[PDB]
Amino acid sequence: MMVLVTYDVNTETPAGRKRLRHVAKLCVDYGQRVQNSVFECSVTPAEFVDIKHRLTQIIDEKTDSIRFYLLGKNWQRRVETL
Amino acid sequence: MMVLVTYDVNTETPAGRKRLRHVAKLCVDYGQRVQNSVFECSVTPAEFVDIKHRLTQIIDEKTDSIRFYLLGKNWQRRVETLG
């Protein structure tokens, strides 16, 4: 299970940056930070549920969002850079 | 094709915020802005080529990057949010 994690946090305050870094740390434990706020994570379903609880606790739910995209097997053949 | 577009730009800079505005304007012609700098686009193979050309004019290649994820049929059943 590869999960692409996209985190929308405003990085123009210390709090937003603090949260991005906290999220970065968690996710990099399970993947690569291909962009500042984008993480290609390889996880099990239980990991994914835990990750999500932790993530819910970090982000500010009223200003921030995270999207999870379940990419298939061979997702690497399905990514392209500009 | 459904293409997820993810754009990495430093919004602590005005020029970076400016470029985000133009990238957004362009991409919201071809899909939905689902977060600040993430776009879900549905494009024909030809429109995808054209959009890449136009994105390349807008972004600063030295400081910015864009990634394109080709998602499959029924990719909407494979997306989940927090927030």
Q: Under a CB-based contact definition with an 8 Å cutoff, are residues B2 and B44 in contact? A: no
Task: State how far the alpha carbon of A70 is from the alpha carbons of A48, A73, A79, B3, B51, in Å.
Answer: 11, 10, 13, 14, 25
DSSP calls for B5-59: EEEE--TTSHHHHHHHHHHHHHHHTSEEEEETTEEEEE--HHHHHHHHHHHHHHS
CATH number of the A1-82 domain:
3.30.70.240
Tell me, what DSSP letter sits at residue B73?
Answer: T
Residue B49, number of CB atoms within 10 A of its CB: 11
Chain-chain contact of A11 with B8 (C-beta, under 8 angstroms)? no
Neighbour-count burial of B45, counting CB atoms closer than 10 A to its CB (0-12 exposed, 13-18 middle, 19+ buried) = exposed
Beta strand extents in chain A (DSSP E only): 2-8, 31-35, 38-42, 65-71, 79-81
Q: Apex CA B6: angle with CA B5 and CA B8, to 5°?
A: 145
Taking only Cα atoms into account, the Rg of chain B, rounded to an integer number of angstroms, comes to 13
Chain discontinuities in chain B, listed by preceding residue (C to N exceeding 2.5 Å):
none
B62 part of contact set with chain A, CB < 8 Å: no
Looking at the complex, report in whole angstroms how far the Cα of residue B78 sits from the nearest Cα belonging to chain A. 5
Report the candidate in A44, A49, A16, A9 with the shortest Cα–Cα distance to residue A30. Answer: A44
CA distance B42 to B58: 20
Complete edge-to-edge strand list for the sheet that includes strand B79-82: A31-35, A38-42, A2-8, A65-71, B79-82
CATH 3.30.70.240 fits B1-83, yes or no: yes
CA angle A17/A30/B76 to nearest 5° reads: 85
Sign of torsion over alpha carbons A18, A3, B71, A78: positive
Interface test with A, best of B60, B69, B76 (most A CBs within 10 A): B69
C-alpha A78/C-alpha B1 separation (Å) is 12
How far the first Cα of chain B sits from its last, in Å, is 27
Token pair of B25, please? 């304007």
CA separation for the pair B30, A22 (Å, rounded):
33
Domain ranges in chain A are 1-82
- Shortest CA distance to B42 belongs to which of B51, B58, A82? B51
